[PDB]
Each structure stands twice: as C-alpha cells, then as structure tokens.
A paper describes a structure:
Finally, cryo-EM analysis of p97 incubated with ADP and the UBXD1 lariat and H4 mutants was performed to understand structural changes associated with these motifs. Mutation of the lariat decreases the D1–D1 distance relative to p97–UBXD1closed, and mutation of H4 shows no changes in D1–D1, further supporting that the D1 remodeling effects are driven by the lariat interaction. Intriguingly, the D2–D2 distance in p97–UBXD1LX is substantially increased to ~40 Å relative to p97–UBXD1closed (at ~36 Å). Moreover, variability analysis of p97–UBXD1LX reveals that H4 interactions are dynamic and displace the adjacent D2 (of protomer P6), further supporting a direct role in disrupting the D2 interface.
p97, also known as valosin-containing protein, is an essential cytosolic AAA+ (ATPases associated with diverse cellular activities) hexamer that unfolds substrate polypeptides to support protein homeostasis and macromolecular disassembly. p97 forms homohexamers that enclose a central channel through which substrates are translocated and unfolded; each protomer consists of two AAA+ ATPase domains (D1 and D2), an N-terminal domain (NTD) and an unstructured C-terminal tail.
Numbering used by the authors:
A (entry chain G): 49 to 68, 75 to 93
B (entry chain A): 23 to 707, 728 to 763
C (entry chain B): 270 to 707, 728 to 763
The structure:
C-alpha cells in the first residue's frame, strides 16, 4: 500500500547514500585548492 | 514454502533486508514492499525488502539487529511473507536498555530517537531491538508500546515517547555491542575460510557423529600482534553460539608446578561439559615454544600436557581448539602433526583496502567532519595493523574532546549526550594522532589484493593477450593442455626501460584472475644477502603457496648484482646466498599450486642466466617505450576521469612526447590538472583543464629514458631474437 | 607415547614406563609400541635435565630386561634414527631399523583407494590423476584430502535437503556422490606435510624417452646391470666394477635422462642432487649433509645417486677467473670421502654430470671415484629425428607434419631446443583450439610458426670447448 511505498523511498535513498565519481573528483580538487590558497 | 537461508548483509540499515530478484518475482512483491519474517519462539520481524545483484537466490541478507530480533543465527532457515496492509502509527513508546545507557545523561530523543525515526518510514513491531550510533556511544533501544498492533510504520506525524526507567536486558537476548562478524574489517578471505571449517560441526553436530567424515579439531591462526586473531575467534563463537573458553600463556605460565597443568586440563574438561565449545589459546608460543628454546623441566612437561590434551579431542566430541601465535614455526612442531593443530590460517596484515574498512568500523560511533578522509589515511598508514588503526581513532577522539571540554567547563559524574553528539573530529585531529602513532609492522610482508585493471594500462595490447595465455589458459582450459601434452610455464620476466608498466602488467593479470599479489623489492633481497638470512626466502614462497592463487612479483632482480659491482663484479660467480634459495624454491614449486612467478629488471644483461632456464623464468617479454598510439592511450587512461577541456589535443601532445615513458606521461596529466586547479583558486583572489595547462606542463616534464638507454634496450632485445 | 610419559612428574614417569613392560609380559605374547621415541630418549647432547637423563636409563634397562620377558617385542617410531640416544641402537634393544619413507605415485593411489572404500564416487572421479598431482603428500595428508572432498559433497547437499534430526537417513548418504570438482577443491585446500623431504623413488623415464645416444645406452647397461646380473663373470676374470661415471658435454643433451633411464630399467631408486643444493651446503658451511645423502643412498639401495651441476661450486668461486685456492672445497671433499668408504656390495651407483669438465676437481676422476667418462655431444641428424618423435610421443601430431624435415634444418639445435619447438607448437595448437570455441591435432602450420621463434642455445664457441676437451681425453 501507500505507507509501504513511502518506506520504499526511504530504504532506496539510504542504499544510494551508502553506495556513493563526481564527489571524488570535487573532493580531490577542494584539497588542492586549499593547498594552493595557503602556499 | 518461502523458506530461505539467513545470510550476512552489506547494507547497514536496520530496516532493510535484501532478497535476490528471482525471489522478488516468486514471492510477488515490489521493490521496497513490507514483509514479515518468521523466526524462532513464535517471533517475527517487519522490514522493507530491496533487491540487488549479490544476494544468493535461496538466501536472505540481513544484519545482526534483524537476526537477534528473530532469534536466528547465520545458516538457519526462516519464512518470509508479504504484509502490504501495514499502516502508519500515531504513538510509539521507546525506552533505552539499562545495559547501554550508563554514565550519560541528556535528552535521548533529541540525540538518538528523533533523527532515527523522524521522516524515516521505518517498519516497527512491538518488542523490536534497534541500535542508534552517535556521540561515541552505541546505544540500543527497545520498543515497548504502540497504538497499532502488532506493527506499523512510523510517520512524520508520529509522536515518539520515552518516559520511564531503562529496560533490564533479558538473559536470552545478546547485546548488539558484542563481537560479531561485522566488527572485522580486512582479512575477510581468512574469516570465510575459517567459517567453512568450523560452522558445520558446531551448528550440525548430529551430522558428523553419524557419518564417516571427521571434523577438524584444531586451527592455528598466526600473524603480527594486533591483527584480529582473537577478534575472529570471539566473532566465530558468538555468531555460532558455541561456548567460548579463553586461555592465554601468561595466565598458565604464572602458575606453580602442579597448578599450570591442572588449570590447562580443566579448561579442556569445561569445554566438553559445555560442548559444542571453542577453546582459544592466545600467545601459544608462551606455553609451547619450540623445545630447543627452553631448558626448564616445567616448560617441557606443560608442552607434553598440552599435546596429550589435544590428542584427547578424539573423545571430547564437538570441541574445537583454536590457537594464536606470531609464527607457525615458533612452537613445538609436534602440535602441527596430523590431528591436534593440523589446520593453518595466515591472518597477516590488511592491505590499503582492509585498512580503510577497519577505520570505518572503529569510527561508526564517531561524528566526523567533512574534511576527514579515511581513505587518504589508509593509504598513508603503511605498516599499521588493526590495533594501530583503532589506537589512531581513539587518539583523534581524545584530542577533539580536550579541545571542547576545556571551553565548556561542565564537570559532573555523567557526560551530556548533546555535548558529545555535537562534537566532530576533524582532519587536524586524525593528522595529529597519525603523526603520534607508530606502526607495529613497519617492515613486515603484506599480501595485497590488486586494484589495477587492464583499462588502467595504455598500449601493450599484445602483451595483455600473451599474459592471459600464460596465466589464465592453464586453468581455464586444462583439457586442451592435457590433450596436447603442454607443460605450462611457471613464470615470466619483464625487461625494458623504466616507467613502462612492468609492475602494472603483473598487478592487472593478478586482478582479472582474482589472485593475490605479493611484491618483493630489491632492498629486501639485499638485506637477506648482507645479513646472511637467506632462509627468509622460504617465508616469501611459503606465503605465496598459502595465499594461492597468487602472483609473486620479484622486482629489482639485479639489486644484488649491482651491490657486487654490477659491471665490474668480484672474484666469484653469478650465484649467491639469496638467488640460490630463490632458485631452489622455484624448482620445488608445482604448477598445481596456482602460483605464478613474475620478475622484473631494468638491467637484464646482468641477471644470473640460471633463472632463465626451463622450469624458471623461461619466458621473456620486452616492454619498450610506448609508441604513438600507445602514448595517446596512456594519456586517455590517466585522464579517464579528469575534466579535460574540449580544446586539449591529446594526439598532438603524444606526438611531442616521443621520448617519454608512461611514467612521464602521467606526470604531465597530473601537472596539467594541478595547473588548472591553481588557476581556479587564483580567480577568487577553471571548470576544465585547458589546452594551455597541458602545454604549460610540457615545459616542466622531462623524459626519464635517454637515447643512450633506448639503444641499449633495443640492442639487447634484438640479441634475444 | 612420549607426551603421556613426559607429562608425568619425577617418580611417576619411570613407574608408568616400568608398568607397561610388566603388563606386556603378563599378557605375552605382546607388542609394545612407543611413539615419538625422540620425546622420551632424545640424543643425550640435547638434554641435561636430571629427570630426562634418568628416564633414558630406565628405558635402556627395560629394553635389556627383554632377555627374560619372553615373547615381548618392543617397536618404536621416530623421525630420524640419529635423533635418539645412540645407546638404544646397540646390539640388542633396538638393533633393527625399517625405513618407511614416503609413498610414490603408485602408493598414493593405493592409499586414496583405501580411504574411499566407503565413499560413493562419481564417474568423473579419477584417483590415479589425483595420485599424480599429490606430490609431497603422505598418507595422513591423503586421508585429509578424502575427508575434505567428502565434506564438500555433503555440505552441498545438506544445505538443500534441510533435514535436521538426531540420526541421518541412510538413503540420503547412499545417493550422495563425490565429484571430481570436490576433489580438486580439496586439493587446493590441502597442504602437503612432506613437500620438503628428499624424494627417493624409481623414475618413470625409460629408454624410449631418449632420442639417439644408442651407444651410451648400451654402455650404461654394461656399467650398471652386468655387475649384478652376471657377478660370476666378474669374479672369473678378476674384474673390479666401476663405482660411477661422469657425464660431460653441452647442456640440454639428455645427461639427466640417461641417469634416470638406467635406474628405471634396473628397478633402482633414483636420488637427484641439484646444483643449488650443493651450493647451499657450500655457502652455509654445512657439508656434513653429504654424509646423510650417501647414507640414504645405502638405505634405499639398490639406487643410483645422481650429482647434477657438479661444477656449480667451481663457477660460484669465479669459474673462468676463480680465486687464490685450488679445486678442492668443503662439499666435494665430503663427497670424495664418502665414495672412498662405500663398497660396491651395497649396489649403489654414482653418476655425475657437468657442463664444464675443465674445472672439475681432478680427484673425482681417479680410480675408485668417477673413473669413467662419457661425452654426450649435440645430436646428429638421425638423433634429432628421434628426439622430436620422442618429445612428441604423446602429442596428437598431424600426419602432415614432416619431423624429418625439421631435423634436417635444426642442425645447430640441442635436444632441449628441439623440445621448445615441440612445446611451442603445442601451445599454438591450444590457442587455435580455444579460439574455435569462441584443433583436433597439431598441424604443420603450428610447427612452422614455432620455428619463427625457436633458436639454438649452444653456439659454436662452446661446441669447440667440449670438442677440445674430448680430444684431450682421447
Ligand atoms: N581486522 C580487524 N578488524 C577490526 N578490528 C581489528 C582488526 N584487527 C584488529 N582489530 C582491533 O585491534 C584490537 C586487536 O586486539 P586483540 O584481538 O586482543 O589482539 P591480540 O590477540 O594481539 O591481543 C581490537 O581492538 C580489534 O578491534
Ligand atoms: N602503459 C602505461 N599505461 C598507463 N600508465 C603507465 C604505463 N606505464 C607507466 N605508467 C605510469 O607510470 C607509473 C609507474 O608504473 P610502474 O609499473 O610502477 O613502473 P615500474 O614497473 O618501472 O615501477 C604508474 O603510476 C603509471 O601511472
Ligand atoms: N636425447 C634426448 N632425447 C629426448 N629428449 C631430450 C634429449 N636431450 C634433451 N632432451 C630434452 O631436453 C630437456 C632437458 O634434458 P635434461 O636431461 O634435463 O638436460 P640436463 O641434463 O642438461 O639438465 C628434457 O626435458 C628433454 O625433453
């Protein structure tokens, strides 16, 4: 039913958050940006 | 009917269970539907079912929280049924467990239950136990009362109550903070091997006593201190339910003559009375070291007493004795004879992947800041064992605590949950602790699982195929090798200029073949030569055998020849202490162990020709500098995930870098990226790596292999025909 | 057993040992088996404790008391005859010895058949194939192998039928067959306990495996068979049999196969000592191990003891440059001593091989040592044909393959070089066969393609070196 469908959306969202290229590339650039900012 | 075997889960969410797709269609439920699970003692649990591509068709993957609620253990069988009529609840009353909330005070709802339940749409049944982590504690709660029955889903408008005293834990209900399989990070291959050996006779004792097949009676674990040898022994006993009895050397050795022998014997008698049972003997080398290393009468007698007690296991049915030592040859060899401790598992040291898993486990309760990077730490913590990474996390936690406690000045007997819940540990706290930590295994041999794939290696398309023929075909198509009377080669040597991927080729083939990778470096062979400790060569090949299937990569084969003068040499021949032991081990190694020996050198002209005879490294592969199409492929591989601008002409760059090796092309790719990033931060005092950034990198990069070296390598390869 | 006696306190271990002998006499005829003897009476040099010295004396007196304890025989088990107090092996007591050793491929098959008598095996199970793969295993390991293979088959079915009760249904076990995949898995998990032990067995190499060298084959029979097949003729003519022969010549010409083939036909045990082992003794100053090698040769007699790479040490010392010393060294001196003390009545024949006879200590060539010398040249045309056909004896060679043509072309190739051609052509046939599934025989194209990579390993510069030496010996 619809109450289970809302539980389905929550279970799938947590699975995707646990599984998670874009954040690895952005984080690697962020680290290099801070080093170039202070050097 | 709908009866499936309980297995381990990957998803850490307590409300989620995974079933394989074929069961999603046979049970006629949609992804995310709510189902009930039937356990033991007329108990059940409600959860949400998701699908994945890793669950076995006939198994259900669930974590410890769900298994405890069902009072089931791994390997048992439960029934699953849909319940699509579950509705929302309006009132849920949750109280903490007395054995988990202690020494802490504050508003438990705001810290734990609110973020857990708020808009969480979790299925909840009366009597469920669940765990909420945070504030450097692991606090479990029980659900005591709900308006709907016997289960419901929590809604955004559900009122959560928490009024009353903590709940006294039931004697049949195990705490969720007890050691289990989900507390072990690396060394998962060893844990799986052990489970297969012990879980069958422990869970199904009626099977073995009714058949002609005898179980294992003893397992010897070994590796450096702090690698989880005891952690595994406890996890196995706690997950199977076997009675766990702990023994340790110092406890037995500190006793007087007539007391140490009786106490050791009693431990065996107690295990039998409580069978099925596991006896874990830690620091075994302290009870029964090699007899040649002891002179006292008491020490020799206690060795004989242990040997007789181990032999008594023919009568003590369903008792398994596990022991932990540092080295398999530090103890009385009698213990390792047929029977007694005739099984061996090498725990060793976790690699970079295992170290990351350990850091994630020991930070589950810690609030980490966005700047904390545990993968970066795992790559830097070479030579560390799990006990070192656990100490690293603890030290970082204490540094973060001191910084806040000296400012808030709240001194009482209990700690405020809100104060700890809002305390985050930053990269400065892990970096400080990392500089203070000192690895316990700085120079130990580490067996790694390779992460290099063929997509990471540019060019050399014909070598990739050749290596598959040498490494995969002998075991993928054994009927053809038997038909044609072919004897597979035992290894291959790479030669050619440096920085062309010789090491990557060995790792990539090991990866595709699902084999372990062992790396031996020149300085280690020099250490064995100079220190007259060439016996350590056997340990290298012994790990290769036990770690099979594996690829054993010997780098810098010429390290000793150069130390002996290289081009001038001395009064002796090519043979030396270390190469002789290596050649001996190679000759004594069979192809049936699935151990492939790979060597590499940058000076093939000075390698003892003996190692190239049939039966050794008879196959020779030349790895030249990359050609025009390979250099482009190398640039693309290094930039596979980089934000390369459309104006970058990778073919033009490859045409200029005619004398560059793959190692030099990588520096260009990395420098061009850093240059683009430098421009980015400067604009605030850019989204892509522009042609100017690659052209600028070209002015700093240099070729590592000169024309004189290219001719030397080409002439050598030509001489070999 | 050792641990049972040693775990007891002073005054209890001696009493219990005495009681065992008294009970055996009361129940005579009787056999007393003492396992782990080295744990009760180790070589005295290894123990100084008052209790350990006394229990040795108690065992010695009880063994001597067997003159009165009629019909009582005492058997003991040890790992090495030299690990125990030498007094035990004096006239009387334990004056007989039996060398159990390690089962060979035939014995391993018999063990596997015994420990599977109760097991239902699938049609794909081939225990002879397993026996050939289980190198270095002893009966204890083959028993564990059968257990692991049986348990794997059980696990696979039990997790499917889900029958949990106090007893097991006979029909469930009776219909459970153990497949070859379960044995192969168990082989990957099993780890031989005797892998590093010396291997002493009758070789499977026969004369049909060696191409050419027809006259050398006959010469070895005269040197090795006749002294024991026709001893009355040697006595009649006053002939003293040779104790051994040294082979010299280019590498890869079959010197090792010659030693194995004669051992096979004579049904004698073959013992192989390799260069790295001679170098290990030289580098580690452990030449005493040579005496154990020659003593094992006597224990395994009739046997052929083959010393390969006899020049390995001379080369390690510089070979062509050398050092300030002479040809004698630690390891060869022990070999010379053991040979001089060995009688021809033990039926132990010594064969050596070297690729550099010009640097062999001349002492080994004197009468009483390796006084015979046989030159093994590179094969001629008719021998190269025999070598190719011998190496391909078991391969599915197509009828279009002209092996005589190849022999006519590969004039500078050694026997080992002809094998590389045979194996390379086989690999090419395997590649073609595998590709056809993504062939039944090795085609001419596979041999001709192999010739693109095959090269001679022995150059004319080294052939002259051997010819000049062979001419020097006339
Ligand atoms: N592989 C691992 N995964 C998780 N934690 C580990 C691992 N190896 C070691 N540890 C941690 O390090 C410590 C090991 O201590 P213990 O098991 O008592 O080792 P020992 O047997 O050397 O005394 C524990 O705190 C354990 O949690
Ligand atoms: N064929 C190649 N494709 C992609 N990268 C390469 C290649 N050859 C070398 N490299 C780069 O050079 C670096 C060193 O490679 P490695 O195989 O470790 O060299 P070596 O074998 O000489 O130690 C790698 O990090 C890789 O990025
Ligand atoms: N006369 C020969 N007949 C058949 N095969 C030979 C002959 N000579 C050499 N070979 C091949 O060469 C390989 C090496 O022979 P081997 O006797 O081991 O050489 P070495 O005595 O120099 O070690 C053998 O596997 C064999 O197949």
């Amino acid at each position: 039913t619809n109450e289970a469908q809302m539980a389905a959306a929550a279970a799938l969202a947590r699975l995707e958050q646990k599984q998670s290229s874009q954040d690895t590339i952005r984080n690697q650039v962020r680290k290099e940006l801070q080093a170039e900012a202070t050097v | 009917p709908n009866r499936l075997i309980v297995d381990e889960a990957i998803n850490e969410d307590n409300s989620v269970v995974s079933l394989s797709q074929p069961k999603m269609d046979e049970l006629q439920l949609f992804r995310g539907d709510t189902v009930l699970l039937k356990g033991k003692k007329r108990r059940e649990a409600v959860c949400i079912v998701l699908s994945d591509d890793t669950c076995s068709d006939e198994k259900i993957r669930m974590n410890r929280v769900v298994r405890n609620n069902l009072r089931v253990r791994l390997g048992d069988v439960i029934s699953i049924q849909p319940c699509p009529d579950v509705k929302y609840g309006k009132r849920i009353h949750v109280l903490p467990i007395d054995d988990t909330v202690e020494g802490i005070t504050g508003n438990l709802f705001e810290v734990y239950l609110k973020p857990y339940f708020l808009e969480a749409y979790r299925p909840i049944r009366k009597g469920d136990i669940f765990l909420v982590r945070g504030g450097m504690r692991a606090v479990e709660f029980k659900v005591v009362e709900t308006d709907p029955s016997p289960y419901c889903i929590v809604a955004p408008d559900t009122v959560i109550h928490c009024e009353g005293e903590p709940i006294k834990r039931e004697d049949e209900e195990e705490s969720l903070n007890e050691v289990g399989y989900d507390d072990i990070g690396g060394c998962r291959k060893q844990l799986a091997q052990i489970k297969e050996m012990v879980e069958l006779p422990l869970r199904h004792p009626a099977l073995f006593k009714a058949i002609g097949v005898k179980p294992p009676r003893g397992i010897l674990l070994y590796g450096p201190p702090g690698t989880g040898k005891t952690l595994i022994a406890r996890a196995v006993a706690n997950e199977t339910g076997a009675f766990f009895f702990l023994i340790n050397g110092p406890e037995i050795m500190s006793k007087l003559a007539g007391e140490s022998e009786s106490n050791l014997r009693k431990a065996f008698e107690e295990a039998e009375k409580n069978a099925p049972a596991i006896i874990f003997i830690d620091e075994l080398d302290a009870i029964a070291p090699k007899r040649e290393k002891t002179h006292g009468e008491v020490e020799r007698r206690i060795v004989s007493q242990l040997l007789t007690l181990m032999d008594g296991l023919k009568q003590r049915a369903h008792v398994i004795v596990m022991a932990a030592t540092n080295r398999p040859n530090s103890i009385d060899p009698a213990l390792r004879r047929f029977g007694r401790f005739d099984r061996e598992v090498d725990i060793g040291i976790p690699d970079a992947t295992g170290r990351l898993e350990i850091l994630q486990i020991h930070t589950k309760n810690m609030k980490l800041a966005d700047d904390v990077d545990l993968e970066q730490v795992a790559n830097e913590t070479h030579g560390h064992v799990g006990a070192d990474l656990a100490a690293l996390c603890s030290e970082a936690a204490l540094q973060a605590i001191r910084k806040k406690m000296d400012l808030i000045d709240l001194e009482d007997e209990t700690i405020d949950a809100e104060v700890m819940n809002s305390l985050a540990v930053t990269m400065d706290d892990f970096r400080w602790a990392l500089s203070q930590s000192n690895p316990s295994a700085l120079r130990e041999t580490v067996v790694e699982v390779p992460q290099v794939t063929w997509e990471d290696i540019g060019g050399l398309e014909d070598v990739k195929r050749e290596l598959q023929e040498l490494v995969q075909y002998p075991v993928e198509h054994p009927d053809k090798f038997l038909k044609f009377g072919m004897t597979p080669s035992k290894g291959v040597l790479f030669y050619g200029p440096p920085g062309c991927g010789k090491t990557l080729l060995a790792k990539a083939i090991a990866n595709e073949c699902q084999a372990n990778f062992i790396s031996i470096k020149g300085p280690e062979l020099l250490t064995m030569w100079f220190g007259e400790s060439e016996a350590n060569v056997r340990e290298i090949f012994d790990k290769a055998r036990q770690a099979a299937p594996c690829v054993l990569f010997f780098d810098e084969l010429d390290s000793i020849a150069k130390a002996r003068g290289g081009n001038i040499g001395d009064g002796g021949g090519a043979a030396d202490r270390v190469i002789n032991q290596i050649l001996t081990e190679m000759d004594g190694m069979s192809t049936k162990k699935n151990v492939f020996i790979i060597g590499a050198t940058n000076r093939p002209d000075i390698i003892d020709p003996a190692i190239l005879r049939p039966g050794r490294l008879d196959q020779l592969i030349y790895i030249p500098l990359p050609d025009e199409k390979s250099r482009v492929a190398i640039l693309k591989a290094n930039l596979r995930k980089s934000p390369v601008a459309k104006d970058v002409d990778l073919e033009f760059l490859a045409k200029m870098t005619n004398g560059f090796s793959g190692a030099d092309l990588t520096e260009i790719c990395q420098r061009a990226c850093k240059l683009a990033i430098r421009e980015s931060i400067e604009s605030e005092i850019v989204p892509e790596i522009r042609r100017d950034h690659f052209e600028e990198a070209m002015r700093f990069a240099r070729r590592s292999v000169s024309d004189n070296d290219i001719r030397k390598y080409e002439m050598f390869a030509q001489t070999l025909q």
